[PDB]
């Protein structure tokens, strides 16, 4: 599912950026850092079994989520 | 961590709604449905062991994520 869910992100990327930029995600810088850890956190949990499933979706998720989050943050350079 | 990450959502809820509404999340209706399944999907996986850890964070995550997603969707009633 994690592999198929990035497919619905094809327009989310363009839509998000096209729809706006300063309020595209409406996320805070502090929250961004916490969110990033969560994505990687799941990967570490899976690594424990020396075979993380989430790692597959993590790559796409981390990149996709980060691209959107950084997009808004980079647009205003600030969030507060 | 999932229990502590909702804490950084205290201003995200107000910030997101206050920051905007039509472009608060910039998410699509179709994506919203897929996203909802992902949250619940993790819960089902954990249920398999008759002890889901994510279930704890799932409640807060699902409610928090849904509240923001529905907020933008309900604001415009459409996303495209």
From Swiss-Prot, chains A, B:
Keywords: Cell membrane, Membrane, Sugar transport, Transmembrane, Transmembrane helix, Transport. Its main location: membrane. The chain crosses the membrane at residues 1-18, 27-48, 54-74. It is a multi-pass membrane protein. The keyword Cytoplasm does not apply. Residues 1-53 form the PQ-loop domain. One of its GO terms (molecular function) is identical protein binding. Disulfide bonds: none annotated. It is found in: Cell membrane. One of its GO terms (cellular component) is plasma membrane. Homodimer. The homodimer mediates transmembrane sugar transport down a concentration gradient. Transport is probably effected by rocking-type movements, where a cargo-binding cavity opens first on one and then on the other side of the membrane. This is Sugar transporter SemiSWEET. The lineage of its organism: Bacteria, Pseudomonadati, Pseudomonadota, Gammaproteobacteria, Vibrionales.
């Amino acid at each position: 599912m994690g592999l198929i869910s990035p497919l619905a992100t094809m327009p989310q990327l363009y839509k998000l950026y096209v729809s706006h930029s300063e309020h595209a995600l409406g996320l805070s810088l502090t929250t961004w850092l916490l969110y990033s850890f969560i994505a990687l956190l799941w990967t570490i949990y899976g690594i424990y079994h020396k075979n993380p499933t989430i790692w597959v979706g993590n790559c796409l998720g981390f990149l996709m989520y980060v691209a959107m989050v950084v997009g808004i943050i980079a647009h205003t350079g600030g969030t507060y």
